[PDB]
mmCIF file of C-alpha atoms in Angstrom:
data_model
loop_
_atom_site.group_PDB
_atom_site.id
_atom_site.type_symbol
_atom_site.label_atom_id
_atom_site.label_comp_id
_atom_site.label_asym_id
_atom_site.label_seq_id
_atom_site.Cartn_x
_atom_site.Cartn_y
_atom_site.Cartn_z
ATOM 1 C CA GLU A 1 0.257 0.101 0.095
ATOM 2 C CA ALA A 2 1.200 3.847 1.039
ATOM 3 C CA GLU A 3 3.159 5.197 -2.247
ATOM 4 C CA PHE A 4 7.127 5.694 -3.183
ATOM 5 C CA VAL A 5 8.830 5.473 0.129
ATOM 6 C CA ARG A 6 7.406 3.587 3.265
ATOM 7 C CA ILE A 7 8.407 6.708 5.705
ATOM 8 C CA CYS A 8 7.606 9.538 6.468
ATOM 9 C CA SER A 9 9.306 12.688 5.099
ATOM 10 C CA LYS A 10 12.520 12.685 6.428
ATOM 11 C CA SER A 11 12.438 16.722 5.728
ATOM 12 C CA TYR A 12 11.474 16.617 9.413
ATOM 13 C CA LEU A 13 14.919 15.164 10.318
ATOM 14 C CA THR A 14 16.296 18.474 9.034
ATOM 15 C CA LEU A 15 15.811 21.442 10.630
ATOM 16 C CA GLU A 16 17.535 25.381 11.022
ATOM 17 C CA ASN A 17 18.748 26.120 13.863
ATOM 18 C CA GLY A 18 17.279 22.670 15.013
ATOM 19 C CA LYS A 19 17.715 19.177 15.921
ATOM 20 C CA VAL A 20 15.493 16.119 15.573
ATOM 21 C CA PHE A 21 16.006 12.851 17.289
ATOM 22 C CA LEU A 22 14.252 9.703 15.209
ATOM 23 C CA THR A 23 13.704 6.588 16.712
ATOM 24 C CA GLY A 24 12.521 4.360 13.793
ATOM 25 C CA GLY A 25 14.420 3.872 10.411
ATOM 26 C CA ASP A 26 13.477 2.872 7.160
ATOM 27 C CA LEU A 27 10.800 0.101 8.261
ATOM 28 C CA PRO A 28 7.425 -0.436 6.370
ATOM 29 C CA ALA A 29 5.243 2.592 6.729
ATOM 30 C CA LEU A 30 7.336 3.191 10.173
ATOM 31 C CA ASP A 31 4.199 2.727 12.364
ATOM 32 C CA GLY A 32 6.124 3.250 15.509
ATOM 33 C CA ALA A 33 8.962 5.531 15.686
ATOM 34 C CA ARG A 34 9.172 8.926 17.228
ATOM 35 C CA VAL A 35 11.311 12.003 16.983
ATOM 36 C CA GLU A 36 11.730 14.774 19.538
ATOM 37 C CA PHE A 37 12.517 18.354 17.713
ATOM 38 C CA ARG A 38 14.588 20.310 19.921
ATOM 39 C CA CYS A 39 15.614 23.939 19.187
ATOM 40 C CA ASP A 40 19.606 24.945 19.269
ATOM 41 C CA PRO A 41 20.397 26.471 22.539
ATOM 42 C CA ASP A 42 19.277 29.955 21.251
ATOM 43 C CA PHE A 43 16.152 29.771 19.854
ATOM 44 C CA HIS A 44 12.893 28.006 21.679
ATOM 45 C CA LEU A 45 10.638 25.262 20.394
ATOM 46 C CA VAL A 46 7.010 26.344 20.188
ATOM 47 C CA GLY A 47 4.445 23.719 19.024
ATOM 48 C CA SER A 48 5.121 20.183 17.870
ATOM 49 C CA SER A 49 7.750 19.365 19.503
ATOM 50 C CA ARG A 50 6.943 15.843 19.145
ATOM 51 C CA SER A 51 5.586 13.968 16.685
ATOM 52 C CA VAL A 52 4.797 10.057 15.932
ATOM 53 C CA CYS A 53 5.423 8.355 12.908
ATOM 54 C CA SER A 54 2.825 6.151 11.155
ATOM 55 C CA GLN A 55 1.351 5.144 7.742
ATOM 56 C CA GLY A 56 4.479 6.830 5.761
ATOM 57 C CA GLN A 57 3.175 9.787 7.615
ATOM 58 C CA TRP A 58 4.037 12.344 10.967
ATOM 59 C CA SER A 59 0.912 12.237 13.467
ATOM 60 C CA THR A 60 1.616 16.398 13.732
ATOM 61 C CA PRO A 61 2.825 18.848 10.999
ATOM 62 C CA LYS A 62 6.361 19.988 11.719
ATOM 63 C CA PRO A 63 7.112 23.014 14.202
ATOM 64 C CA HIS A 64 9.094 25.972 14.028
ATOM 65 C CA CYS A 65 11.532 27.217 16.572
ATOM 66 C CA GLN A 66 11.435 31.252 17.571
ATOM 67 C CA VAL A 67 14.059 33.485 18.814
ATOM 68 C CA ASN A 68 14.394 34.008 22.717
#
C-alpha cells in the first residue's frame, strides 16, 4: 500500500537551527517511529515538539523555532 517510500517525510529530520531525535529508521510504513524536536540553545521550540511517525506520515506537522 502507501506510495513510493514507506517512510514519513524525511524532511522533518533536518531543521534550521535545530536537531531532530528520530527513532524508527526505514521500516515498512514506520508506524512506530518517534521524533523529538529540539531547537538549538538560542531559539525555543513552540509547537509540535513531538511527532510520531505512522503509515508513512507524521502524526503532527513540523513546528518552528522562535528566537528568544
